[PDB]
UniProtKB/Swiss-Prot annotation:
It comes from Homo sapiens. The modification Phosphothreonine is found at residue 110. RNA helicase that acts as a sensor of the transcriptional status of both RNA polymerase (Pol) I and II: promotes ribosomal RNA (rRNA) processing and transcription from polymerase II (Pol II). Binds various RNAs, such as rRNAs, snoRNAs, 7SK and, at lower extent, mRNAs. In the nucleolus, localizes to rDNA locus, where it directly binds rRNAs and snoRNAs, and promotes rRNA transcription, processing and modification. Required for rRNA 2'-O-methylation, possibly by promoting the recruitment of late-acting snoRNAs SNORD56 and SNORD58 with pre-ribosomal complexes. ATP binds at residues 44-51. Transmembrane segments: none annotated. The lineage of its organism: Eukaryota, Metazoa, Chordata, Craniata, Vertebrata. Homodimer; homodimerizes via its N-terminus. Found in a multi-helicase-TICAM1 complex at least composed of DHX36, DDX1, DDX21 and TICAM1; this complex exists in resting cells with or without poly(I:C) RNA ligand stimulation. Interacts (via C-terminus) with TICAM1 (via TIR domain). Interacts with DHX36 (via C-terminus); this interaction serves as bridges to TICAM1. Interacts (via C-terminus) with DDX1 (via B30.2/SPRY domain); this interaction serves as bridges to TICAM1. Autoantibodies against DDX21 are found in patients with watermelon stomach disease, which is characterized by prominent stripes of ectatic vascular tissue in the stomach similar to stripes on a watermelon. A motif (DEAD box) lies at residues 153-156. It is found in: Nucleus, Nucleolus; Nucleus, Nucleoplasm; Cytoplasm, Cytosol; Mitochondrion. This is Nucleolar RNA helicase 2. The helicase and foldase activities reside in two separate domains, the helicase in the N-terminus and the foldase in the C-terminus.
Length: 372
């Protein structure tokens, strides 16, 4: 339900056709900022709902404001996205939830004439890629001097791809006034490097708001699996398939060389595993780590002895064979899990006689395990 937000019954019915029945956190925490006219930078992980976080409050805003839509009117909202595929998706999301507003999407690799006719007939929300939008400014057909809202979607990707200069050329036309008359500026992305914000800041009022759901996100899950030591190898095979699977990276830490050597020879993982312990001379240790990084094998079994000082690559899954005594090392290893934006998984095995040790790890690391 939508009781906390000024969303009309018409919009709610369209949202149901898209499977939307309540607002995700990034949407709920940004609605009032966007709707009330504040400049905003919002950061949330990929897939968490950034598109509707700007599209729903903007559409409700325009539905209240643009009661008299004349032929030829200039857009009120501009959304720049870095690829044709991303621009199309954002435009589709707008046009699925408003049947009142004129929504247009301008990208390259497509005819100019149809875009000319959208501009002649009138546009309320313009979505596009920077290149084609800049072309239409230069050819004199697109009027961006009456914008009230500007969205830079996936702004990190957009500037990484080289669009800073084209974006600045487009926005220079729309921010010709002093601040109070400038468009509201909305930035949405999963990251915002320093150098990207240094570009965008030029278009943000000093009063801008920030919603960062990255800093509060659960990016590493801690699981504790109660297990007799004889079953560990078979369970390790299962959790590797679940959480690392194809093309994955797993590192297993154990106490003794015998455990590390036997675990790496166990038919549950042997075909994809190499071991690392204090008997291995430096040169082969280095060779083994290069093969772990370059995909030669997917499971590294290391004694806590060999792991002291070792530089740990990013991995999908960390497994501790028993609750670690060196919680500092555990905290460090857990921070290495989760690749390509995915949530990392750390698994601690434990036996009945080790259950209080799990509580000690929880206290010393300030975490809580999910017990399985
Ligand atoms: N409140 C919601 N309820 C249900 N599905 C949603 C909601 N918000 C977004 N989605 C869906 O989640 C998916 C990801 O949304 P998207 O805006 O692409 O995420 P992001 O831009 O954060 O990567 C889309 O299929 C979208 O329609
Ligand atoms: Mg998005």
């Amino acid at each position: 339900s939508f009781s906390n937000f000024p969303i009309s019954e018409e919009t709610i019915k369209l949202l149901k056709g898209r499977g939307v029945t309540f607002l995700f956190p990034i949407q709920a925490k940004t609605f009032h900022h966007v709707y009330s006219g504040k400049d905003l930078i919002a950061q949330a992980r990929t897939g968490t709902g950034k598109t509707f976080s700007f599209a729903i409050p903007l559409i409700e805003k325009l539905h209240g404001e643009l009661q008299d839509r004349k032929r030829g009117r200039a857009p009120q909202v501009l959304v720049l996205a870095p690829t044709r595929e991303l621009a199309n998706q954002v435009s589709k999301d707008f046009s699925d939830i408003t049947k009142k507003l004129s929504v247009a999407c301008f990208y390259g690799g497509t005819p100019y004439g149809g875009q000319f006719e959208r501009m002649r007939n009138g546009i309320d929300i313009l979505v596009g890629t920077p290149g084609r939008i800049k072309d239409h400014i230069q050819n004199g057909k697109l009027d961006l001097t009456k914008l009230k809202h500007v969205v830079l979607d996936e702004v990190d990707q957009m500037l990484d791809m080289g669009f800073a200069d084209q974006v600045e050329e487009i926005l220079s036309v729309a921010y010709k006034k002093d601040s109070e008359d400038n468009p509201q500026t909305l930035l949405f992305s999963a990251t915002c490097p320093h150098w990207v914000f240094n570009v965008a800041k030029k278009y943000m009022k000093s009063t801008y708001e920030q919603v960062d759901l990255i800093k509060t996100a659960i990016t590493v899950e801690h699981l504790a699996i109660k297990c007799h030591w004889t079953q560990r190898a078979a369970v390790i095979g299962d959790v590797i398939r679940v959480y690392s699977g194809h093309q994955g990276r797993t590192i297993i830490f154990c106490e003794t060389k015998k455990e590390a050597q036997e675990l790496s020879q166990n038919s549950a993982i042997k075909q994809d595993a190499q071991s690392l312990h204090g008997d291995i001379p430096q040169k082969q240790r280095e060779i083994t780590l290069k093969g772990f990084r370059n995909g030669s094998f997917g499971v590294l079994v290391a004694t806590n002895v060999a792991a002291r000082g070792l530089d740990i690559p990013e991995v999908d899954l960390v497994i501790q064979s028993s609750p670690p005594k060196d919680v500092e090392s555990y905290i460090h290893r857990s921070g290495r899990t989760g690749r390509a934006g995915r949530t990392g998984v750390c698994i601690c095995f434990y036996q009945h006689k080790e259950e209080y040790q799990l509580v000690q790890v929880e206290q010393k690391a300030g975490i809580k395990f999910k017990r399985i």
